[PDB]
Structure 1
Amino acid sequence: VHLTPEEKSAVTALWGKVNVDEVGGEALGRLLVVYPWTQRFFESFGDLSTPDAVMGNPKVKAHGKKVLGAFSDGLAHLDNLKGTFATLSELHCDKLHVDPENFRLLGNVLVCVLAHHFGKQFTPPVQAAYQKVVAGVANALAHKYH
């Protein structure tokens, strides 16, 4: 995935300041609040019928830290996203039936969350390098689908 090492370094510098625990829950929860259709995969998480209900929902914070943890590992592997995510892609396709469109939604929700969290530090060139990254991740997670 085409990241210059000016882009590489900027993704890297920023990600280090990220509370993966907290950003994960935020992203997943906003995902579920902003684009409620994505709730369809999370019936088993209990109450998601309001914003406050989704945002404080323990299983959402917990799934988000897991989603972001795995996103976080991908960053060490920008050279080999397909590889890093092959097994998760199969998991999402064959076991979970997650339409890969969701990975795009989440990627954008994530870029919003980083904006919110880093403010002016989330400069347009840093955002651009995150859009490449988030798109790269959504394609790798989609690539084992059939």
Structure 2
Amino acid sequence: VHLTPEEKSAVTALWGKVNVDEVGGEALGRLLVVYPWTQRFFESFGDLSTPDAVMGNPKVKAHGKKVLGAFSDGLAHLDNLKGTFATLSELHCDKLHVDPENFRLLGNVLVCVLAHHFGKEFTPPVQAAYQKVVAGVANALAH
């Protein structure tokens, strides 16, 4: 992803403040609540019935922490997102058959989570930078 110096400094500065253990299962859980067909991909996580059962689910917190692990690894490699995400695109495309549009959905949910955890600190330029980063990650997994 081509970014400015100021967009990389904003993404880095706001991403350093991110509670990984919380924002992960927050974004994955809101993915399962807002976009419920994605629950088909996580049927081995247990009860996913209510939103309070999804947001209170320890496999959703653990796996969401894995997903933010992959996002932080994509932030350390913004010029090499296809080289970072080839094994994960292999997994999500062949073994899991996840549609590419779903990746975009998760990324947008992540941005909402960031706004929900940063408020006025999540300015429209910070959203612009995280949007083109997030689109870089989703387009790196759709390959």
User: What range is the shorter-chain TM-score in?
Assistant: over 0.9
Give the whole-Å Cα distance in 2 for the aligned partners of 1:4 and 1:54. 37
Shift, 1:8, TM fit: 0.9
Hey, what does 2:47 align to over in structure 1?
47
SS at match of 1:47: coil
Give the whole-Å Cα distance in 2 for the aligned partners of 1:88 and 1:25. 19
Tell which deviates more after alignment, 88-97 or 22-31.
88-97
SS at match of 2:85: helix
Hey, what does 1:24 align to over in structure 2?
24
Give the whole-Å Cα distance in 1 for the aligned partners of 2:40 and 2:101. 13
Hey, what does 2:140 align to over in structure 1?
140
Give the TM-score normalised by the residue count of structure 1.
0.95
Provide, for residues 34-59 of structure 1, a one-character-per-residue CA deviation record: whole Å limited to 9, x for no partner.
11111110111111010001000111
Give the whole-Å Cα distance in 1 for the aligned partners of 2:107 and 2:37. 16
Shift, 1:23, TM fit: 0.2
Identity %: 99
Give the whole-Å Cα distance in 2 for the aligned partners of 1:18 and 1:112. 13
Hey, what does 1:14 align to over in structure 2?
14
Hey, what does 1:73 align to over in structure 2?
73
Q: Which stretches of structure 1, 4 residues or longer, exceed 3 Å deviation after superposition? A: none
Listed as ranges, the gaps of 5+ residues in structure 1 are none
Count of paired positions:
143
Shift, 1:137, TM fit: 0.2
Give the whole-Å Cα distance in 2 for the aligned partners of 1:52 and 1:23. 16
Listed as ranges, the gaps of 5+ residues in structure 2 are none
Shift, 1:94, TM fit: 1.1
Shift, 1:17, TM fit: 0.4
SS at match of 1:77: coil
Shift, 1:102, TM fit: 1.1
Shift, 1:74, TM fit: 0.7
Shift, 1:64, TM fit: 0.1
Q: Tell me the C-alpha RMSD between the 2 structures.
A: 0.9
Give the TM-score normalised by the residue count of structure 2.
0.97
Shift, 1:5, TM fit: 1.2
